[PDB]
Amino acid sequence: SALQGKVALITGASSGIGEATARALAAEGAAVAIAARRVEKLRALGDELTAAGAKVHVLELDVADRQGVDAAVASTVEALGGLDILVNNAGIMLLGPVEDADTTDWTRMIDTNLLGLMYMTRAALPHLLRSKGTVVQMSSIAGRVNVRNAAVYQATKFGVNAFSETLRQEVTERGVRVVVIEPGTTDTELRGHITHTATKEMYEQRISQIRKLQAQDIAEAVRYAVTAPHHATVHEIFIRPTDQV
Amino acid sequence: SALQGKVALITGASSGIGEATARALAAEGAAVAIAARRVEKLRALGDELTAAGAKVHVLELDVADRQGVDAAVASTVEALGGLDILVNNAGIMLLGPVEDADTTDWTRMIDTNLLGLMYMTRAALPHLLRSKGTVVQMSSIAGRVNVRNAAVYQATKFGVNAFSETLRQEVTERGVRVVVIEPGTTDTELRGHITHTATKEMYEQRISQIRKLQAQDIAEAVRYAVTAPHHATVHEIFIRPTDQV
Amino acid sequence: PSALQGKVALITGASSGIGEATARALAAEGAAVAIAARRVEKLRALGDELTAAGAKVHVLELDVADRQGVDAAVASTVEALGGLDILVNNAGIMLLGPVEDADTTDWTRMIDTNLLGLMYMTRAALPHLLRSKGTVVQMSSIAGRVNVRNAAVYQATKFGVNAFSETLRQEVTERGVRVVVIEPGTTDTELRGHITHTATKEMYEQRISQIRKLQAQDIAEAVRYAVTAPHHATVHEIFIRPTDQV
Amino acid sequence: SALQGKVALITGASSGIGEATARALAAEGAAVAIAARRVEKLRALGDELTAAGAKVHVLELDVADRQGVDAAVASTVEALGGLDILVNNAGIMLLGPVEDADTTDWTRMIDTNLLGLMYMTRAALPHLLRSKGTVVQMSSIAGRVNVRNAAVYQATKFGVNAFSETLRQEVTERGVRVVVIEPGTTDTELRGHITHTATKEMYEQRISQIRKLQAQDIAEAVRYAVTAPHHATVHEIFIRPTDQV
């Protein structure tokens, strides 16, 4: 139990990567504040983790809401005593051409993937500074490589990376570690949300012929990064499916 | 006159790089639609350009306004007959630490630098597709390199770059050229807007000891890129002050 | 527990630093280790240590810049240990100094060892890795990701290693050969003792004196994490920086 | 004539991009030292340029030869009075898989593309420092993007870029400008040299259905960069064929 007595706040914890990460960190002895919009799914996970001997704090949160963000962080510190690890995992992937796009796709991705992550980072920062803690940014291969029909999604993830590198420069000397996780195709609910029907089906066929990364693989990457000695910042882990060029 | 009979729409044309670019493209024989919020400054530039023999269409526009963007593009095509060149130059640079930041800095930069650019791009695209035209994105060294106290600004510019590369992959085969200009320190009004006083002062001192790039230098980069033969897409020009490591 | 039981790892640059720690780490996971470098005395000492701890060891005197020596070293490893599952291309040298009026033997040495030697080893190992659906680990650097003054040619070799390795990944990944690239920042090893430009050697020492450096063991743990990941996952890049260092 | 009284040394001047660049610079009034191994082709070009009113210095040079490099630079400064522009254009592209590769492909590419370029840069530097001149590195899309069957070639070109950025940091404050040109597919003799037959054929098919960049397009990129005002360093120009995703 490398994380005994530590407090982790995980956004997007109701499914996929965030759910696996919350489990992984709790398994290492961390108290976990689990945040997302689907409260019933969070409660179900919270019950499971509590029944497994973990300390859980359930947070109904929209990361795009600046006020909600500030309250969520304050609630976590109040209920669990501090903040050692923030996992900015909440995100959505809305694929489709730039041409004649539904721009609500764009505003949603920017609010959640970029602004939400930045809001959470900022609110957590005073607490992470005191605990010499770690912020883990859930980026993507989409923050390293551009492919067609993912322009704005890729814009958000490249943006996350630049924000995070800059953040590292700003806070690293005070012992706040900045970790960026960059998964390739991972088998989650993420793709079910694509609003462009033609691209949703194109993407599904594209990834149908590979062994996908599992949510647990990515949780393991986070676990490796956060349990590394404090003098080491695993700033980037770029993990790809072996089957995928 | 390499651009005779062509129409260019330049956002952020009321000062700085956009003003110089509008002059440069007009000098090459292009009809210019000049867009920004300060109508008085646009009118003054429009008068000067018209007095020099250019065809000018003045557009009062906030690029963050989706509806205003659509109307501005439609107004341009109606008044000037089409669209061959879009210069997405409207932008703001609000520097300061992430820690305890004024988050209105962030929303402004994202709305203008990222969302505004993407809105203009999308609205212009049908017209650029017909004319096999060129979209010029005004990025920055901040889209290539991260320094302290520019996290969200750099996020927007790295985002612009990823969006633009992806756009290139999507439209290049149909003859729409995607050009990204990346200036280093350029002597404009840009820095006057920084809301974090300590950072504004720090930045001023940092750039006080170099010969800065001039707005005209960047206009020249744009002119070189857009007058290149159609089979060549000058996708990136990274121009730095020689005095600046 | 032993995630690499029955696997064979060949580690170049095993006589000190990161390669030594990596050979220990892999052996601790149950892998048989072929340890390769030029200082045979140091290899023998490590080999004795590992053998005494219950490991299977094959000692290889090798200059990675030697194309023929490379081929023989791979052949010797597969003959002695039965196959090849993991290659760690760790052999390397860092010769810092300005471009201006540089001692160009600095350059040829770095290119021969860091770039060409790594490529030769990769190529010779590949038929064996293809059969075993194995993993090649490239020891790159922060120098393959960021450029600073007085490390022009070294950074050229490391950026070169990264492009070579990404391209390799595209070529072999579908046949189940995983390409892993490890990118340490400042790590406390013998590496810097070799700098021939005296002024730069001193400048570098002062710059890194103010930080808690990465340990060779930290980097070995990165390698361990990457190679013990399930086969369907290729941890293509791990970029590990000293927390103290902007 | 923006380069009147300037001296340019161009490596790889016997064909392709180097030939076009030597013509373009001479057209701007620069004296040109033209260097390559095929003396006969250099003399024919030298005759052409001299007949057009240019000052020409013919140099038989293998850039992989460190002593030949030193003599070539000394010969140039002796014959033409100094050195204002170096174009490191000599290069070879030997494509093929890593698996079972002919490793003489590798040593040739490293000797010419990387070491030869570095040798030339180093020998020229004292002279460039005096003249506050410009070094132009002929990199490639292969220094920016990795594709299959170009591993070692891409290694040399990514290497050239890192070397050159580092060089910029080291010499830029003393007024030596470092320019990196990155062409995509350009119609030259380059591809005729590929030793791996299957890959040579695969590459030819790949580039058969695009309008390729012309050697003259690349020469124009060099010309734009070197005639920019001294306070501006056009550090990167990334030029892609518009037809090529």
Ligand SMILES: NC(=O)C1=CN([C@@H]2O[C@H](COP(=O)(O)OP(=O)(O)OC[C@H]3O[C@@H](n4cnc5c(N)ncnc54)[C@H](OP(=O)(O)O)[C@@H]3O)[C@@H](O)[C@H]2O)C=CC1
């Ligand atoms: N799956 C993949 O192939 C890859 C995914 N990623 C990244 O991983 C992250 C997690 O997504 P993934 O697990 O894949 O897919 P999921 O859809 O399963 O997870 C997304 C999670 O984010 C939450 N969420 C979405 N919007 C908000 C919001 N406005 N406020 C708070 N929480 C929100 C969702 O919970 P709820 O709806 O209850 O709010 C959900 O739990 C994303 O950042 C994604 O970009 C990166 C690389 C590869």
Ligand SMILES: NC(=O)C1=CN([C@@H]2O[C@H](COP(=O)(O)OP(=O)(O)OC[C@H]3O[C@@H](n4cnc5c(N)ncnc54)[C@H](OP(=O)(O)O)[C@@H]3O)[C@@H](O)[C@H]2O)C=CC1
């Ligand atoms: N100066 C520099 O060192 C560098 C600048 N850049 C980029 O260059 C671009 C132009 O900036 P620069 O000329 O330097 O500085 P300026 O402030 O002089 O120009 C910015 C222009 O953008 C306009 N603008 C701002 N917000 C909006 C909006 N929401 N809608 C429409 N127009 C808007 C302003 O006009 P108005 O107020 O009338 O609307 C103004 O004309 C920006 O994209 C910037 O990021 C990139 C690299 C270096």
Ligand SMILES: NC(=O)C1=CN([C@@H]2O[C@H](COP(=O)(O)OP(=O)(O)OC[C@H]3O[C@@H](n4cnc5c(N)ncnc54)[C@H](OP(=O)(O)O)[C@@H]3O)[C@@H](O)[C@H]2O)C=CC1
């Ligand atoms: N130390 C650091 O801060 C960092 C180092 N690195 C990389 O780590 C790798 C290992 O270096 P590190 O452990 O740091 O320093 P060391 O000097 O301690 O290790 C270098 C190892 O490589 C071997 N070696 C050198 N040249 C050759 C050659 N021609 N043929 C075979 N073996 C050779 C040496 O053994 P011998 O002399 O007996 O042959 C030695 O075992 C290098 O590739 C380096 O670039 C990357 C990031 C940071």
Ligand SMILES: NC(=O)C1=CN([C@@H]2O[C@H](COP(=O)(O)OP(=O)(O)OC[C@H]3O[C@@H](n4cnc5c(N)ncnc54)[C@H](OP(=O)(O)O)[C@@H]3O)[C@@H](O)[C@H]2O)C=CC1
């Ligand atoms: N064509 C393309 O698609 C692209 C090419 N490039 C780069 O452009 C540069 C020039 O190539 P390009 O013009 O296309 O092809 P060419 O083969 O036509 O030109 C290469 C030139 O380099 C010379 N050369 C080769 N080896 C040496 C050497 N050892 N010493 C001195 N000169 C040498 C050749 O002349 P000689 O045999 O007489 O010595 C020739 O003049 C290269 O660096 C290449 O990597 C970059 C991006 C795209």
Ligand SMILES: O=C(O)[C@H]1/C(=C/CO)O[C@@H]2CC(=O)N21
């Ligand atoms: O490679 C993939 O699976 C997907 C992806 C998935 C989630 O980041 O992100 C990038 C954009 C895209 O379509 N890629």
Ligand SMILES: O=C(O)[C@H]1/C(=C/CO)O[C@@H]2CC(=O)N21
């Ligand atoms: O280098 C500079 O002058 C400035 C800049 C200016 C406008 O992009 O962008 C980056 C962010 C910053 O502070 N840099």
Ligand SMILES: O=C(O)[C@H]1/C(=C/CO)O[C@@H]2CC(=O)N21
């Ligand atoms: O950051 C550092 O400590 C050193 C280094 C060390 C080993 O790669 O590589 C890069 C080049 C340099 O000076 N950096």
Ligand SMILES: O=C(O)[C@H]1/C(=C/CO)O[C@@H]2CC(=O)N21
């Ligand atoms: O895109 C291309 O045409 C070629 C190329 C050509 C010359 O650098 O460089 C990259 C490596 C490759 O195959 N690409």
